[PDB]
Amino acid sequence: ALLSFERKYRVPGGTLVGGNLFDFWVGPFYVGFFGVATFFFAALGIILIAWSAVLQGTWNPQLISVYPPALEYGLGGAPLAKGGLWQIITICATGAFVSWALREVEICRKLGIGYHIPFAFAFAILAYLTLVLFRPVMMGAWGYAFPYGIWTHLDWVSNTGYTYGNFHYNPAHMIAISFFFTNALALALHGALVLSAANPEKGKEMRTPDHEDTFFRDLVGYSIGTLGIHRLGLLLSLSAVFFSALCMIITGTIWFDQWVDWWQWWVKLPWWANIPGGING
């Protein structure tokens, strides 16, 4: 039912809409107005994906695919069987994600903590909306969004990437990838450091934050601190997602050619554009 310590926190108030209409729990889950909304949307979306499985003709979970409308339909509606189910599922998913963020706001708010978590979830929501809503609308058709399938949206990724050659040459792409790799590195180092401090050589006393700073300063020579590492983690993840959204919003919209052709500008800069030798020329 309740954690040993949970009861002193289960108080009324701190909710955006609906007073105490839905200000109650179902098991551990806090419900709220936006919890009601998000349960509705999630349930409807999962059901409509199952109905897509029925219409398509497979029950293999890895072959179920809900394709967006084809290019000729433009930005209008499509029949449910050939593109409309995708649109309804997209609306359901957007509503579910937004309601989840607002429910998180309500919970953060009943507990008296900052709103960093719904903040950071909004970044992922905006990346999803970039892929599904902003770019296809800016670009003319719902057919540029990805299908809802486990292995068929990878086909969308591959085709979109190879439309512009090697997508590795997108520069915002490189920045986003560097942020992702740095984020994974920092997460591994942080988890390892805290665990090694709390679980020292075996039977000797528990370590202190001073030991963590000492270890990492011995390793490379500059410890960032606990507050520093948590700030850096939040910012690395958010920067990665932001640059992903940027690299995809500019693709097919202001850049239409091979991306190495973008990299071509530095090579042609006046004070080396003509020299013989090297890779280029």
Binding site: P270, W271, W272, A273, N274, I275
Partner: protein, 43 residues
């Protein structure tokens, strides 16, 4: 801070001089070494 300003100024002056010399060396003309080679039959 005079120290930071002086370091930035020195870096700026040197980098700008190198850029200007490189711009000159890029052009077929003004390339003192190469026009000297043409003059003195170094081919």
């Amino acid at each position: 801070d005079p120290r930071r300003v002086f370091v930035a100024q020195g870096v700026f002056l040197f980098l700008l001089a190198v850029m200007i010399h490189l711009i000159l060396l890029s052009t077929p003309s003004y390339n003192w070494l190469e026009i000297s080679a043409a003059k003195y039959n170094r081919v």
